[PDB]
Each structure stands twice: as C-alpha cells, then as structure tokens.
Design a protein around this ligand. Structure first.
Ligand SMILES: NCc1ccccc1
Ligand SMILES: NCc1ccccc1
Ligand SMILES: NCc1ccccc1
Ligand SMILES: NCc1ccccc1
Ligand SMILES: NCc1ccccc1
Ligand SMILES: NCc1ccccc1
Ligand SMILES: NCc1ccccc1
Ligand SMILES: NCc1ccccc1
Ligand SMILES: NCc1ccccc1
Ligand SMILES: NCc1ccccc1
Ligand SMILES: NCc1ccccc1
Ligand SMILES: NCc1ccccc1
Lengths: 309, 309
C-alpha cells in the first residue's frame, strides 16, 4: 500500500500489540508519563556530552526553564540553536527530547538551548508561543552568539516557524540565520490527503490530534497557530523535513512550497517510509538515526554558508 | 526598487553602454558569435584541469559532439555529470560554457560531459530534447559510471528537467542520482510577475526571449517544452537555483514548489541580487564565482548522500 521501512513496520506492530489506554483516554499527567516512559524504552540515551546546564530565565508570565547542551564549551561566539520540543502543546519536557538535543549539539557543533515552555491545558494558547518568543529573545540578549538557529519537532516545528515570524517582524539582538522545523504543524485544518491516508495506525492519530487540540484551544485565525495563512517573505533559510507516513506531511510540503514562492531559500527533505515522531524513537526505529544525522548534516552546512558570507 | 548587487549593477551599466545591434536584430550565426565574444570578455578562463577530451557520438540525426572534463582521470567509477548548455535553444556551444564545466568538474570531483545538441532554427523543437536524451543514454551505456547527475542552465535547465522525466519513465542503463537545473525555463507562457519586472534591462529580455522562442518553435502542450504542466512525482533529488532579477525566476520557484508537493527532495536556492546567465559571467560579475561555488558545494553533498545510502 504505502511504502514503509521494515524497521518502522516492526515498530508499529510492537506498538499495536501493547495493552493499556490510548493517550486520548488519559488525563494530561498520565499522557505526560506515557511519553516519558516511551522515550526511556524507544529512544537512545543522552550519550557523552561535555556540558549540560539548567537554569531559569525571566519571562512575561513567569520564569521559564531552559537547558543548555554544548559539546565544545571553549568555542568562540558563533551560532546557537534554540529548540522547542514537541508533544501537541500538552506533553513533552526537557527530558523527553534530551537525547535528540545532545545529539544535535554533537553533530552541529553549536550550543543547543532547549525551552521548557508552558503547556496546555494549564496554560492554553497562546502561552507556548509567548514563552518561546520570550526565551528566544532572552538567548539573543544574554548568550554569546552571532545568530540564532531555531528548531523543533511537531508542535515545536509550529513554534519554530511562529517564532521566526515574530523575530522577522521585530528583530532580536541577533539575527535568525536559519530555521529547521521538523514535521511541523502549520494550520489547524485537516483537509489533506496525508491526513486521510495516515490518520490511523501511524502513532499520530486523528484521536490524539483532537485531544491535543482541545486542550491547547488555539485560535485558528492567529498567525501563532496557523502560519501558513500569513506571508512568509523575508524568513531565514529553512530546512523543513517531513515524514512520508505522517498525517502532517502534506501541510509541511505546502509550507515549504510557500517559502519557495516567497523567495526564501528552502531545503525540503522527506523521511521516506517513516512516521511522525521519529526524532525521539531512535532505539525503537534504528533508521531514525540516519534521518537525524542526514538532516543535521545539511543544517550544519546551511549555517556554515550563512556564517561564511 | 529591486535589490541588485553593486557588481551586478556595474556590469549592467557596462552592458547598457555598448553600441551595436541587439541579438534579436541578428541572424543566428551573428548571435552565436556575440555569445562567444561575450564569454571571452566576461567569463573566467578554463583554468587548470587534468583532462579535457572531445569526441563524436552517434545520435539519432548524426554525430553529436561531446566534451569530457575530469580533474581526476585515474578515478574509480562513480557518478558522472551530463551537462546541457543554455542559449535559448539557438546559441551556445561547447566553448561558451567551457569555463563553467571545468569549474564544475574541479569542485564536484566527478567527470562532466557537455553535450553539443542540435540548435534551432536549423533544427527546431524537438531536436534539442531528442539529442539530450540520446546522448545521456549513450553516456550511461558507454562511460564507466555508477549513476548520472543531469544539469544545465536556462534552455539547458529545461533540457535537464525534460531529460530527467524521460529517464524516469524509461530508465537508462544507470539511474539519475540527482538533477541541477540552473535558472530553468519550465513553460512557454510569460504570465509571471518576474517577467513583468525584469523583462527589460537585465540581459535576458522580452525581445531576446521572443526571438529565441520563434526560432525554436516549441509545442506549448508538449512535456518536452512545458514540464511544469506534467506530474513531477518520482523525479530524483533536485537542486534548483534561480536568479532574483531574472524574468524566469517565478517559474523556477513554481517548479521547485511543484517538486516538493510531489514529494521530491528539493533544494531551492535563489541568487539574490543577480541576473540570468551569471554562470558564464564570472569575470564581469565577480560575485558569480560565489553563486557557482555555493551551488556546486551543495550538489556535491546531495550526490554524496545518494551514493552513501
Ligand atoms: N550559560 C547560560 C545558560 C545556562 C544554562 C542553561 C541555559 C543557558
Ligand atoms: N509530536 C509528539 C507526538 C509524537 C507521536 C504521537 C503523538 C505526539
Ligand atoms: N502537534 C501535534 C498535533 C498536530 C495537529 C493537531 C494536533 C496536534
Ligand atoms: N488543532 C490543533 C492545532 C493547533 C495549532 C496549530 C495546528 C493545529
Ligand atoms: N565594496 C563593494 C561596493 C562597491 C560599490 C558600491 C558598494 C559596494
Ligand atoms: N567604493 C566602495 C564603497 C562603497 C560605498 C561606500 C564606501 C565605499
Ligand atoms: N572597470 C570597468 C567595469 C567595472 C565593473 C563592471 C563593469 C565594468
Ligand atoms: N575518447 C574518450 C572520450 C569520452 C567522452 C567524451 C570525450 C572523449
Ligand atoms: N541566454 C540568454 C543570453 C543572451 C545573450 C547573451 C547571454 C545570454
Ligand atoms: N517560449 C519559448 C520556450 C520554449 C520552450 C520552453 C520554454 C519556453
Ligand atoms: N532559454 C531562454 C528563454 C527563456 C524563455 C523564453 C525564451 C528563451
Ligand atoms: N568586472 C570587470 C569587467 C567588466 C566587464 C567585462 C569584464 C570584466
């Protein structure tokens, strides 16, 4: 039917055989625990890294936790990545995406600063965008860097694009030199062939998407929810990656196409035969390691071209 | 106004001051000579390269001249680039694009084979696509290689895409690994904002485009003229570059967007503040050297990822 990598199909079959409630049948605290446990079982470890540090920074509606990863702390000032995790604006935290952030720091050879932004339903829309924009501006002001590289997965891919638009309109202390949205959401609408094709049996389901969206309570007319409905001109060079079996695939394609139509230099990658969520499934789906390394190698080159110009 | 690099504006002012007939006021033989002279004055030299060889190959209508460039002739079999020069399907030859082809061979560290395909009006459409396809199949059958990288500028960027579509539908003896259309034409129509904005004073003009089109006499309904009107699914990884002051810019953007909407892995670059034809203007417009190097560095990486998988 649809091209599926053998290791991905193996993982889906393992998923399907598990007993216990679906995420959508759980309170937020249970869902949060489910994702932590899934990462413990199906993601790789942090691995060796020179420096990881946690602190709190000021934010407009309270303090924001952030985590710095750096495998070469005696570096000269250069690019810094600011990372927003996924989790449907409800789940995920600094631990769920810790393996990926450490790997990104190692491959990219830049510091990675992960943001622990406020989550729904305790803090509904627009808390996540507000925190992500404030933390990103804080990094520009307070960290030695020459420019910012924004990135994140899923909900965090949404936040990447939203925050890049915010900084385009009102620059931070340092420019955004590149962005890397990973299987992002860019609209609330579901009128996509990929949604029809992959909205069941591929981890991110119609059920889970409804559950997340009901808790987040986004305004579908606000650019901070639905950036595809707003001009993309003047955004930084973009690396956008989708997964081929992902309900969100077609909207990601559409956003990348929109960037190109606005003259934004754009690299589009599609992880063929894998699913939404792969960046935190690198033990369960070993091929994810190649998707991660592939994309980050290309991002490192985009950033090098920017810093060499 | 429109963003123009200072060195580009300098070159346009020099162009504007030149006396003598416009290309479109000339017979084809005169236009051909004009382009050769322009390259002698405004392009860099071939430079040092280990091997350049000429031969004839058997094409459908007679001998097709080809030229092989290789800076490492003792190499093991690997990818080979097949290059189709531009010139509006009327002008250009193996000398007009010789500096670029030698530079491509040096940077890519692969052999480059340039094709001297049949030109209009002596040989109208579809002679050029026929020759380009036949020569590409010849290379796959007769040159030691593992796969093909197709590339070309302007009319040659059209021929890149058309040839890749033909080989998708009926594979050659070696797969097409990647394609690199450079400021391509992908349709016969002129309903584009970039055409209205840059159709005068930026080298490729409304007048020259009409003159080329009239000689080539393409069928606007045929995929070998207007690839944008036909499915792009299943094409190889694509690096498409445009120039920001080019009448063809918007159709190039549109074709790259179409590739992404078909799931083709696509790298889109836009040479900001420069014109159509820059790859043969690297002495007149020194910044063209950076546009050339930047694209070929990216292409080298695309090919390495393909061949490493
Ligand atoms: N050195 C600033 C910092 C510390 C910890 C986490 C993020 C940023
Ligand atoms: N984007 C976080 C996620 C992954 C898989 C399933 C649901 C949510
Ligand atoms: N961020 C995961 C997601 C996508 C679409 C709708 C709801 C949740
Ligand atoms: N339906 C949830 C959602 C919210 C914001 C952006 C995309 C999707
Ligand atoms: N130093 C490059 C340059 C030349 C002319 C005008 C502006 C800039
Ligand atoms: N001719 C170089 C230059 C351009 C602008 C301002 C100062 C110097
Ligand atoms: N020295 C004459 C000149 C300089 C730059 C571009 C065109 C012509
Ligand atoms: N006689 C060798 C050769 C091969 C390809 C192109 C030119 C020459
Ligand atoms: N292929 C357009 C063109 C015309 C004249 C000189 C250079 C380039
Ligand atoms: N109008 C000239 C032309 C011919 C073929 C393809 C594109 C443009
Ligand atoms: N290949 C140069 C060109 C483009 C469009 C129309 C005519 C010629
Ligand atoms: N960049 C000076 C120049 C202008 C025209 C032709 C050759 C060189």
């Amino acid at each position: 039917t649809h091209y599926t990598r053998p290791d991905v199909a193996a993982f889906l079959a393992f998923l399907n055989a598990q007993e216990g409630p679906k995420m959508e049948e759980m309170p937020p605290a249970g869902a949060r625990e489910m994702m932590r446990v899934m990462g413990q079982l199906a993601d790789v470890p942090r691995g060796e890294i020179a420096k990881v540090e946690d602190r709190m920074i000021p934010g407009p509606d309270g303090d924001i936790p952030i985590r710095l990863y750096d495998n070469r702390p005696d570096r000269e000032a250069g690019p810094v990545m600011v990372f927003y995790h996924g989790g449907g604006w409800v789940i995920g935290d600094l631990e769920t995406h810790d393996p990926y952030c450490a790997e990104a720091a190692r491959i990219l050879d830049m510091p990675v600063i992960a943001i622990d932004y406020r989550l729904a339903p305790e803090h509904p829309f627009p808390a996540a965008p507000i925190d992500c924009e404030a933390a990103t501006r804080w990094v520009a002001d307070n960290i030695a860097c020459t420019g910012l590289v924004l990135s994140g997965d899923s909900a965090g891919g949404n936040l990447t694009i939203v925050t890049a638009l915010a900084l385009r309109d009102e620059p931070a202390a340092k420019p955004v030199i590149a962005i890397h949205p990973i299987y992002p959401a860019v609209t609330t609408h579901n009128d996509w062939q990929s949604y029809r094709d992959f909205g069941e049996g591929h981890l991110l389901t119609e059920g889970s998407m409804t559950w997340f969206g009901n808790h987040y309570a986004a305004d579908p007319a606000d650019r901070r929810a639905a950036p595809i409905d707003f001009p993309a001109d003047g955004l930084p060079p973009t690396l956008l990656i989708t997964a081929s079996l992902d309900p969100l695939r077609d909207q990601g394609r559409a956003y990348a196409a929109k960037l190109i139509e606005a003259g934004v230099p754009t690299t589009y990658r599609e992880a063929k035969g894998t699913i939404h969520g792969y960046i935190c499934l690198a033990q369960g789906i070993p091929s994810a390691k190649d998707d991660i390394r592939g994309a980050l190698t290309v991002l490192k080159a985009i950033v090098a071209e920017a810093t060499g110009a």
